[PDB]
């Protein structure tokens, strides 16, 4: 396992998300499903000129898996996936510049729900999760596990777990007061409200 320090700007973003009083936490799901949709578009685009890109899996979907016993909400997609370099470089984002633009917008009157307009929507996971684990597999690299409970650092390791073919799995270890996001009715409500125009099947698993 390798441990890395977040860039100062990203540690500042995470602290703002964790510490700011902001009741509209539900937007984390829209942000994560939006990232999944973007990753699925990328592999579909590459497959148009190279059909062998889909040898690691032809299905393009998003699965939402709540687990009440482990207190986790997992979002699985079969998108392009991230390489080790992508994971280290802020999960494939330009997060340093995105954070700068987002923080300026917040000072001017914008609110936390607009985070996605700054290309740093992933970090909204910290509105509801005490720890986030990202398992990812890109065609050109091995399967990795990224993890962070914030606190200024993240870890990366080769994942020896269940092989995923291709794509990304985001495991949200929920905060104790955020268990409403494991309830079927609550998840359905959020998906219908914010993700009605996502062009891939979104399957809400049951227990």
Ligand X SMILES: Cc1onc(-c2ccc(O)cc2O)c1-c1ccccc1
Q: What does the binding site for ligand X look like in residue numbers (CB under 6 A)?
A: 32, 35-36, 38-39, 42, 77, 79-82, 91-93, 122, 168, 170
**Treating both helix axes as pointing N-terminal to C-terminal, what angle do 95-107 and 8-19 enclose, rounded to 10 degrees?**
40
Q: How far is the CB of 145 from ligand X (least distance, A)?
A: 14
Name the residue nearer to ligand X (CB basis): 59 or 107: 59
Name the residue nearer to ligand X (CB basis): 36 or 133: 36
Question: Residue 175 corresponds to which tokens in the numbers above?
Answer: 């905060």
Q: How far is the CB of 156 from ligand X (least distance, A)?
A: 14
Q: How far is the CB of 39 from ligand X (least distance, A)?
A: 3
Q: Cβ distance 183 to 175 under 8 Å?
A: no
96 is in an annotated binding site: yes
70 is in an annotated binding site: no
63 is in an annotated binding site: no
Q: How far is the CB of 131 from ligand X (least distance, A)?
A: 15
**Hey, is 149 helix, strand or coil?**
coil
Name the residue nearer to ligand X (CB basis): 105 or 116: 116
Residues 6+ apart with CB under 8 A from 72: 66, 171, 172, 173, 174
**Hey, is 77 helix, strand or coil?**
strand
Ordered strands of the 153-158 beta sheet: 2-5, 153-158, 144-148, 129-137, 167-174, 72-77, 62-67, 202-204
Q: How far is the CB of 109 from ligand X (least distance, A)?
A: 26
159 is in an annotated binding site: no
Name the residue nearer to ligand X (CB basis): 21 or 167: 167
Name the residue nearer to ligand X (CB basis): 16 or 121: 121
Residue 140, phi then psi, degrees to nearest 5: -90, 5
Q: Strand pairing partners for 155?
A: 3, 147
Q: Which amino acids are annotated as binding site, given as ranges? A: 35, 77, 96, 122
> Which parts are annotated binding residues for ATP?
35, 77, 96, 122
């Amino acid at each position: 396992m390798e441990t890395f320090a977040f860039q100062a700007e990203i540690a500042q973003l995470m602290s703002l998300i964790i510490n700011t009083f902001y009741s509209n936490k539900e937007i984390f799901l829209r942000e994560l499903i939006s990232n999944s949709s973007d990753a699925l578009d990328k592999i579909r685009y590459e497959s148009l000129t190279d059909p062998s890109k889909l040898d690691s899996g032809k299905e393009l979907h998003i699965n939402l898996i709540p687990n009440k016993q482990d207190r986790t909400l997992t979002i699985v997609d079969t998108g392009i996936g991230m390489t080790k370099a992508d994971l280290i470089n802020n999960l494939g984002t330009i997060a340093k510049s995105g954070t700068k633009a987002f923080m300026e917008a917040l000072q001017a009157g914008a609110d936390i729900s607009m985070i996605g307009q700054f290309g740093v929507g992933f970090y909204s996971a910290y509105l509801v999760a005490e720890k986030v684990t990202v398992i990812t597999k890109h065609n050109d690299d091995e399967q990795y596990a990224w993890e962070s409970s914030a606190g200024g650092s993240f870890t990366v390791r080769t994942d020896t777990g269940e092989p995923m073919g291709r794509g990304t799995k985001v495991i949200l270890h929920l905060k104790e007061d955020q268990t409403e996001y494991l309830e079927e009715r609550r998840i359905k409500e959020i998906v219908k409200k914010h993700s009605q125009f996502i062009g891939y099947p979104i399957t809400l698993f049951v227990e």
